[PDB]
Amino acid sequence: AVLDLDVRTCLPCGPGGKGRCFGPSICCGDELGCFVGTAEALRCQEENYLPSPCQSGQKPCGSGGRCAAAGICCSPDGCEEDPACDPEAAFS
């Protein structure tokens, strides 16, 4: 997706703002693991309370998608701990 407005980088997620919103009912903090509609993901509840634009930060990867949360590489259906970035990955 594209940018939101003047202030880029959508709303954070997780603890304080380590994470952020990604695709749909999802939230995944790179330095804060991946949560789809989970406790640490509810921050995206605001992503469906006010019809407006939004942007994410999904650094691509060969794991059927782009990187995101803890060594995550997300897809259009959901994310997964991808060895591409940190969990199922190397000792990253």
Side-chain angles (χ1 to χ4, degrees):
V2 292
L3 263 335
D4 184 65
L5 70 341
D6 242 301
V7 292
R8 293 163 171 157
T9 110
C10 229
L11 228 80
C13 211
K18 261 33 178 99
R20 68 137 104 75
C21 272
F22 284 63
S25 215
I26 216 146
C27 239
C28 281
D30 194 10
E31 59 151 329
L32 177 255
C34 233
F35 323 62
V36 197
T38 319
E40 253 82 20
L42 47 16
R43 238 62 127 130
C44 232
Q45 252 190 116
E46 76 95 1
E47 243 290 296
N48 59 71
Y49 274 7
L50 229 307
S52 82
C54 178
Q55 180 66 308
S56 292
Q58 278 237 140
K59 30 262 146 34
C61 20
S63 201
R66 334 306 195 290
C67 188
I72 289 276
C73 192
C74 208
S75 322
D77 246 286
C79 323
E80 61 147 307
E81 44 126 14
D82 306 273
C85 265
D86 203 294
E88 200 99 283
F91 47 93
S92 150

